[PDB]
Amino acid sequence: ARLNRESVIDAALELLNETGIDGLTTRKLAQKLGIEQPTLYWHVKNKRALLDALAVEILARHHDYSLPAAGESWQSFLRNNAMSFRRALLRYRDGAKVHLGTRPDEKQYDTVETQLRFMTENGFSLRDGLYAISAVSHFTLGAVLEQQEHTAALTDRPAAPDENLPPLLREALQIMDSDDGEQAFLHGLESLIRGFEVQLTALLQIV
Amino acid sequence: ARLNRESVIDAALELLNETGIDGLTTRKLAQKLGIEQPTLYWHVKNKRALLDALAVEILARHHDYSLPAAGESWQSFLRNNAMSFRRALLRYRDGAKVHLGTRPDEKQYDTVETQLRFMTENGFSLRDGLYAISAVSHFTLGAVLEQQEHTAALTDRPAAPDENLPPLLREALQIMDSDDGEQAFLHGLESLIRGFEVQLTALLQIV
Ligand SMILES: CN(C)[C@@H]1C(O)=C(C(N)=O)C(=O)[C@@]2(O)C(O)=C3C(=O)c4c(O)ccc(I)c4C[C@H]3C[C@@H]12
Ligand SMILES: CN(C)[C@@H]1C(O)=C(C(N)=O)C(=O)[C@@]2(O)C(O)=C3C(=O)c4c(O)ccc(I)c4C[C@H]3C[C@@H]12
Ligand SMILES: [Cl-]
Ligand SMILES: [Cl-]
Numbered sequence: 456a457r458l459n460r461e462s463v464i465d466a467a468l469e470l471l472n473e474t475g476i477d478g479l480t481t482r483k484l485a486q487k488l489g490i491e492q493p494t495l496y497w498h499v500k501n502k503r504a505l506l507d508a509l510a511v512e513i514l515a516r517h518h519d520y521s522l523p524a525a526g527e528s529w530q531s532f533l534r535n536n537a538m539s540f541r542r543a544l545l546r547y548r549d550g551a552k553v554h555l556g557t558r559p560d561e562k563q564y565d566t567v568e569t570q571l572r573f574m575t576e577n578g579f580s581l582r583d584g585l586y587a588i589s590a591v592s593h594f595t596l597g598a599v600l601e602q603q604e605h606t607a608a609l610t611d612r613p614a615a616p617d618e619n620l621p622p623l624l625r626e627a628l629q630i631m632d633s634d635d636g637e638q639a640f641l642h643g644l645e646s647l648i649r650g651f652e653v654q655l656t657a658l659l660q661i662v
Numbered sequence: 663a664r665l666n667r668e669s670v671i672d673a674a675l676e677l678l679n680e681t682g683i684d685g686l687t688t689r690k691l692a693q694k695l696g697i698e699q700p701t702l703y704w705h706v707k708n709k710r711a712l713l714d715a716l717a718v719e720i721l722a723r724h725h726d727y728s729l730p731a732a733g734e735s736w737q738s739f740l741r742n743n744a745m746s747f748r749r750a751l752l753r754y755r756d757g758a759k760v761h762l763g764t765r766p767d768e769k770q771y772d773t774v775e776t777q778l779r780f781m782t783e784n785g786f787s788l789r790d791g792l793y794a795i796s797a798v799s800h801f802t803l804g805a806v807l808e809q810q811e812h813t814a815a816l817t818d819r820p821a822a823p824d825e826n827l828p829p830l831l832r833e834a835l836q837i838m839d840s841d842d843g844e845q846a847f848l849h850g851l852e853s854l855i856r857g858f859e860v861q862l863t864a865l866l867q868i869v
């Protein structure tokens with residue numbers, strides 16, 4: 456096996472889709488690369504180092520709407536950015552789980568700084584811009600986590616035995632699983648954005 | 663050790679706060695109860711069975727705003743219910759993680775049915791009521807997950823070495839960690855609720 460950074464992460468990503476985040480072991484990574492663990496240890500000191508790098512690479516490779524277009528409204532950038540973040544989290548098994556608990560990396564500083572600055576130039580205080588970004592981020596992670604983990608868990612349950620399901624819930628779940636949760640996410644996303652807009656344009660009035 | 667259902671779950675909860683969800687093993691649970699694994703196996707067939715029961719018990723014990731008060735508005739119930747859900751997720755280590763991927767349990771059917779019905783009697787279609795509930799749920803899980811996992815991870819990082827932190831981000835993170843993320847959550851929560859309200863009261867008008 457070739458053992459530069461890009462080769463290690465490629466292989467770690469393959470493994471993540473075979474085994475999930477819980478089977479992403481240094482031991483199994485070494486098997487994958489056909490090397491002995493101490494060779495691996497020279498390049499990758501532990502699982503956390505690895506999870507952090509993966510979190511960053513996942514977005515670097517598949518998160519393509521991280522900056523606003525020229526003249527694009529804040530409402531639009533936030534929608535496009537959340538969509539882009541979702542596709543990215545979703546391209547790998549337990550990908551949301553891999554992002555969880557990370558904070559921005561040095562390679563991401565410039566990008567996140569621009570996002571923050573961009574909100575502030577649209578009339579958000581830093582505090583409110585921070586909250587809008589966080590809310591979008593938290594909402595999108597939760598939706599993707601519930602979706603991916605429910606699909607993981609699907610294999611180990613007796614699965615909604617119905618009959619004794621009451622009527623609304625019964626119809627609710629049929630609807631929730633009509634699709635991957637995209638409609639639900641997209642509808643919620645609009646609610647969030649609109650809600651921030653009425654806050655912004657309230658200024659110092661009571662809303 | 664006493665080995666009824668309530669004793670097993672009590673002990674599993676103690677363990678969850680000592681070891682986290684990843685160290686919640688049947689092996690370690692048996693140690694905790696001072697019994698041999700086959701004795702445990704008679705009562706608790708595996709980790710998933712256990713995680714499911716825990717998810718339900720956590721809410722049964724600490725989620726006290728699961729139904730609307732008499733005459734309470736939908737906006738109010740959703741705020742109170744999300745707050746109540748958050749405190750609950752947060753009372754145990756990796757408690758959000760334990761909830762993840764669960765779906766409503768038989769013991770919860772009646773409660774969730776009422777929530778659904780209640781939205782529909784306030785003018786939501788089932789579909790829109792479902793989305794509002796889901797959005798609140800997903801948002802609250804994400805916020806709590808990021809908070810709990812960042813705190814877990816805190817122990818294993820070199821921790822924001824600053825200096826080369828750019829100014830807005832730098833001030834952003836000071837703000838994000840001024841508190842446990844409560845302000846951010848509460849502010850986002852209002853945005854979500856208000857956004858649903860403008861949707862509701864749009865009816866068939868363009869908004
Ligand atoms: C989802 N989208 C709003 C953002 C985004 O586009 C990026 C990215 N890398 O391009 C991200 O890194 C992002 O997904 C993301 O992960 C973010 C955070 O993790 C984060 C944080 O944890 C604490 C403070 C701040 I301040 C942030 C910035 C947030 C920005 C998030
Ligand atoms: C957070 N709050 C809106 C709700 C709640 O009060 C309860 C509860 N048990 O009282 C819950 O169980 C809840 O937390 C919760 O966990 C829910 C779900 O998991 C859920 C779902 O996964 C798929 C369809 C539906 I339809 C639901 C109902 C949602 C209701 C959520
Ligand atoms: Cl090499
Ligand atoms: Cl007993």
Ligand SMILES: [Mg+2]
Nearest residue numbers: 554557558559
């Ligand atoms: Mg993040």
Ligand SMILES: [Mg+2]
Nearest residue numbers: 761764765766
């Ligand atoms: Mg749930």
